[PDB]
Design a protein around this ligand. Structure first.
Ligand SMILES: C[C@@H]1c2c(ccc(O)c2F)O[C@@H](c2ccc(OCCN3CCCCC3)cc2)[C@H]1c1ccc(O)cc1
Ligand SMILES: C[C@@H]1c2c(ccc(O)c2F)O[C@@H](c2ccc(OCCN3CCCCC3)cc2)[C@H]1c1ccc(O)cc1
Lengths: 241, 241
C-alpha cells in the first residue's frame, strides 16, 4: 500500500470482502416468537468473527502491533458493521437487509425500545449511497478508511513505536485516498468532480461515526471485555497453516 | 457560493469569524472557589449567541428555511464549539485555551467527573492540527462544512421544499470543497498533495463528531428545549436595522 498500485489495492480489497450471512431462526415457525434483538445480536456477533479475518487482509493492517490492531477494531467494529449493512440495503428502498432472509422496515424496528431512531438513520444513509450511486470499488475503500481512521487518534501515548504506527497508518490512508481518486478518474469524472466526489464520500463517514456512537449508547442502554475477545481472535497462532 | 469565487467565499468567512471571549470570574479571588463546569458552561453559552450570528454569515445558510437552520445548528453546535476550542489551542501544547484568561491542562480536567477523557481527545485534535499546520483559511472552511453537513442527513421527511433544501446544501458543500482545493493549489501543493490533504482534513471531521457525541453523553450524564432557544435567536425581526 505504498509500492502497491491503486488497482492493486482495490483488488486485494474486493477479494478480502467478508461473506454475507443468514439470520438463524426456523422459517417454519411464526415470527412473533423470534426476539428481533436476539436475531440481530447473534448476527452481529457472527459477522464480527468474519470481520477480523477481513481486517487482516486490509493492506497495512497487519504490519501494526497486536495492541494497535485490537484498538482500531474496538473503536470501529460497529461503524464497519453498519456501513456493511447500509451497502447491502442500497437497492432495497425503505428496507434494511440484515440478512438475505431478514429484510426489515422501520415499522419492524419500532418493536425495540428506541431502535427505530437508529433504523431511520441507517435507511437514510442507504438512500444517500443509492443517490450517489456508490460503487463496490468505492465502498471497500471507505470501509478500510473507517478501520484505519476511527481509532488512530485514540492512540493516547507516544512511545517511539506508537509514533511509527501513526506515521505508517496515515501513509496507508493517503494511498487509499490515491486509490479512490484513481477509481473516479478511471470512471471519467472531471478533476473537479473527483475532489467533489471525494468530499461527499468522506463526509458520509462522519454520519456513520454518529450512528455508531448512538448505537453504542443504545447497546449499553440496558461478559468478557471486547478488547479481550478481539485480542483472542487477532492473536492467532500459525499452527493451522 | 455558486457564482461567488473561492477567494470570495474565503473572505466572507474570515470576516464572519466570531470574537474570542473571556471567562468571567474575579482574578483577585482564589481558584478553589471557581466551579470549573460553571466557568465552562457560562462560556459555552456566551459563545453560542455569537455562533448564531456567524452562521447567518456563512454563505447559503440563510437561504435555508428557519426550521432547517434551527435543525442544523441543533445538530452541530457542540462540534462547532469544539473545533473552535481546538483551533485556538493549536499553539498551546498540552493546554486547552478556553479563554485568554482560561488556559487549562488535562490535570485540571480531572476535577470534573469523567471530563479528562474529553480533554484528552480535544488536546489530541489540537496536536493533529498543529502537526498538519492547519491554516485559518482552511479552518473556517472546515467549520462551515460542519454546520452544513452534520444535520443534513437528519432532515427526516421530504416534502418538495425539503428536497430543495438538501440540493441547495450539497451544492454549497461542493463549492466549499472547491474553495479548500483552491487554497491548497494556491499554496503550491501538488495535485496529489491536494487531494491527500483534503482527505486528511475531512477525516478529522469524523473525530470531532465523535467528541461531540461523547460530549453530549457527558453533558447529559447528570430548562427550555434547545430548539426553542435556537429558534428564538434565529427568528429575529428586522426592526433593528
Ligand atoms: C444496525 C445493527 C446491526 C445488527 C446486525 C447486523 C448488522 O450488520 C448490524 F449493523 O443488529 C443490531 C446490533 C448490532 C450490534 C450488536 O452488538 C451486540 C454485542 N456484540 C457485538 C460484537 C462483539 C460481541 C458483542 C447488537 C445488535 C443493529 C443495531 C445496532 C445498534 C443499535 O443501537 C440498535 C441496533
Ligand atoms: C469542550 C467544551 C467547551 C466549553 C467551553 C467553551 C468551549 O468552546 C468548549 F468547546 O466548556 C465545556 C462545555 C461545553 C458546552 C456546554 O453546554 C452547556 C449547555 N448550554 C450549551 C448551549 C445552549 C445552552 C445549553 C457546557 C460545558 C466543554 C465540555 C463539553 C462537553 C463535555 O462533556 C465536557 C466539557
Amino acid at each position: 500500500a505504498l509500492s502497491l498500485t491503486a488497482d492493486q489495492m482495490v483488488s486485494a480489497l474486493l477479494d478480502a470482502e467478508p461473506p454475507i450471512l443468514y439470520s438463524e431462526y426456523d422459517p417454519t415457525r411464526p415470527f412473533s416468537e423470534a426476539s428481533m434483538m436476539g436475531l440481530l445480536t447473534n448476527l452481529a456477533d457472527r459477522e464480527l468473527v468474519h470481520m477480523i479475518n477481513w481486517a487482516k487482509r486490509v493492506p497495512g493492517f497487519v504490519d501494526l502491533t497486536l495492541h494497535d490492531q485490537v484498538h482500531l477494531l474496538e473503536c470501529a467494529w460497529l461503524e464497519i458493521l453498519m456501513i456493511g449493512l447500509v451497502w447491502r440495503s442500497m437497492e432495497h428502498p425503505g428496507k434494511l437487509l440484515f440478512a438475505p432472509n431478514l429484510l426489515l422496515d422501520r415499522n419492524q424496528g419500532k418493536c425495540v425500545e428506541g431502535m427505530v431512531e437508529i433504523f431511520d438513520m441507517l435507511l437514510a444513509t442507504s438512500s444517500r449511497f443509492r443517490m450517489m450511486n456508490l460503487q463496490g470499488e468505492e465502498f471497500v475503500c471507505l470501509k478500510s478508511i473507517i478501520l484505519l481512521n476511527s481509532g488512530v487518534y485514540t492512540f493516547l501515548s507516544s512511545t517511539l513505536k506508537s509514533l511509527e504506527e501513526k506515521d505508517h497508518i496515515h501513509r496507508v490512508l493517503d494511498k487509499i485516498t490515491d486509490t479512490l481518486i484513481h477509481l473516479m478518474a478511471k470512471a471519467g469524472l472531471t478533476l473537479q468532480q473527483q475532489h467533489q466526489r471525494l468530499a461527499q464520500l468522506l463526509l458520509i463517514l462522519s454520519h456513520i461515526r454518529h450512528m455508531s456512537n448512538k448505537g453504542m449508547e443504545h447497546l449499553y442502554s440496558m461478559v468478557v471485555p471486547l478488547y479481550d475477545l478481539l485480542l483472542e481472535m487477532l492473536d492467532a497462532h500459525r499452527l493451522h497453516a
